[PDB]
Every structure is written in structure tokens, then in C-alpha cells.
């Protein structure tokens, strides 16, 4: 007996999309979190969702989710430094096949950031809260997004001056940030609009200045790519594997 009892331990974190709780089994003493509160998007959304870089969805206002007792990437990110590059690497890795499944059966997380990319005991990359997510594809049929969401720093360009736009390019971008982020320790601008000194400075291809200065030459490269405004000319996924530092080996 005893089995569907839970205690709650300690508040994890908070949210306008509700306060957190760690619930420990009384019985196996597993752990899991508790989220307390639209609503019905996300639970949705979280019932398709199964995949070892995805938080895990339990079941269900309580939603039961997989605890990630690594904390948050944002964590592991040292202000003005970043991290180690291998580190990087291997948490980028965990990022895209994250996304790339998400994008696989049609859905944008929209708000990816490292407050939002988790870590397990294992330290791997669990990809969290899809309360902002959304589905883009849907019998196959694409459907464009109009609706700003996410954070500034880490929305595409393409979010603040366009009506419509597709929604990969979109995550692929913040992805952008989120690997800069990791390598830097630093954001790179308050938003990308030209009326951001920083940004206009990257499109002006000067390098040389922070927070670039401090990111070696292939991830740099990797970078030129991803963080491109015309999210046309954008690289996609299914290339950023080919990418040169993606696939080198480092210790
Ligand atoms: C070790 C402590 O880390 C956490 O606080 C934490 C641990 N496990 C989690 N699983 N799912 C979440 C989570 C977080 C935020 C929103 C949602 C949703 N929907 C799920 C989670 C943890 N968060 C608790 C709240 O504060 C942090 C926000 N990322 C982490």
C-alpha cells in the first residue's frame, strides 16, 4: 500500500506559469516535480512528448514532471567565462537532438534559454516548460507563427519586424544564443535590432570585440552561421551536423 503518496520537500521555483514543488514518493522515494496552477496547451503538448532530452511528463492543477536534480545550464555558465569548450559541445549536442525531435513531430518550444534547459544527476540536457510552446506542423501542412513569444535576448530578428515567420529558424537562432551563452558567459545584446549597438556590430562582422573575442575560430564559425538575420539563409539543423566543430572530437 502507500504507493500514490507524495510529500512535498522543497520549493524548486517559481513562474507566471506557477510555483514548483519537489514531491518524493513516501514508498520508492522517487522524486518528481510538482507543478501548481493554456494550461490545457500545456498539458497537451507534454502527453506527446518522450524523449531522453525532454523533460519527462508523468501525468496530472498538479502536473507531475521528472526532476532534474542538475539544476539549470544557466548554472554551469560563468559570468565572462562561460565554460569549458568540451562541455559546450557536448550540452549543444544534447540541445539539438532536443530540438530536433521537437521540430520532428511538430512542435517549437519558443522561449529555449538556459533557464529552460535542465540537468539531470547524469548532467544531461533535459529541454523544460513548454507552457510557450506551440504546434507548427500538423499533418504536414506547416503553419506560419505571428505571435511574439520568448525572451529578447534570445528571440530571432525576424520575431520583432515580421508579421509571420516560420518556426524553426526561430529555435535554431536561439539555440545561437544559448551556445554563445555557454561559451562567453556572457549575451551577446539586449535584443537583436539595429538600433542595438551589439548587434549592429555583429553584422558588421567585427569579431574582434566581446563577446566573440573570447570564442575560438570553429565555433565562431559554427556561429556565423546560426546567428544569421535572413532566416532564409539561416543554417538549418540537419546541417549544423555537418557543421566542423559540431563533429570534433574534444577533451
Ligand atoms: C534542482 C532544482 O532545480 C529545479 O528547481 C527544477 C528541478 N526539476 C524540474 N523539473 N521541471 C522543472 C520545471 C521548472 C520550471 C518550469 C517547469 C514547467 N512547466 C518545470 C524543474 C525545476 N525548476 C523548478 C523551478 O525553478 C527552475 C525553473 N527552471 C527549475
Redesign the pocket.
Known amino acids: 500500500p502507500f504507493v500514490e503518496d507524495w510529500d512535498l520537500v522543497q520549493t ?4 507566471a ?2 510555483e ?1 514543488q ?1 514531491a518524493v514518493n513516501r514508498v520508492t522515494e522517487e522524486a518528481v ?1 510538482v ?1 501548481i496552477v493554456n494550461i490545457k496547451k ?1 498539458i497537451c503538448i507534454n502527453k506527446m512528448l518522450n524523449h531522453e532530452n525532454v ?1 519527462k511528463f508523468y501525468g496530472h492543477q498538479y ?1 507531475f ?8 545550464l544557466f548554472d554551469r555558465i560563468e559570468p565572462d567565462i562561460g565554460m569549458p569548450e568540451p562541455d559546450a559541445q557536448r550540452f549543444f549536442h544534447q540541445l539539438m537532438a532536443g530540438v530536433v525531435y521537437l521540430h520532428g513531430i511538430g512542435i517549437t518550444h519558443r522561449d529555449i534559454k538556459p ?2 534547459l ?1 540537468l539531470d544527476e547524469r548532467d544531461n540536457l533535459k529541454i ?4 510557450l510552446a506551440t504546434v507548427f506542423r500538423y499533418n504536414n501542412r506547416e503553419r506560419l507563427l505571428n505571435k511574439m513569444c520568448g525572451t529578447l535576448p534570445y528571440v530571432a530578428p525576424e520575431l520583432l519586424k515580421r508579421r509571420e515567420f516560420h518556426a524553426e529558424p526561430v529555435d535554431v537562432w536561439s539555440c545561437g544564443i544559448v551556445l554563445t551563452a555557454m561559451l562567453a558567459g556572457e549575451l551577446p545584446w539586449d535584443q537583436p535590432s539595429d538600433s542595438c549597438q551589439e548587434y549592429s556590430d555583429w553584422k558588421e562582422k567585427k569579431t574582434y570585440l566581446n563577446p566573440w573575442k573570447k570564442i575560438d575560430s570553429a565555433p565562431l564559425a559554427l556561429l556565423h552561421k546560426i546567428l544569421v538575420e535572413n532566416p532564409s539563409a539561416r543554417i538549418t539543423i540537419p546541417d549544423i551536423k555537418k557543421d566542423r566543430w559540431y563533429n570534433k572530437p574534444l577533451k
Not at 128 to 131: R, W
Open positions: 524548486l521555483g517559481e513562474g506559469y506557477g514548483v519537489l516535480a507543478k500545456e523533460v502536473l514532471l521528472e526532476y532534474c536534480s542538475g539544476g539549470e533557464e529552460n535542465l523544460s516548460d513548454f507552457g
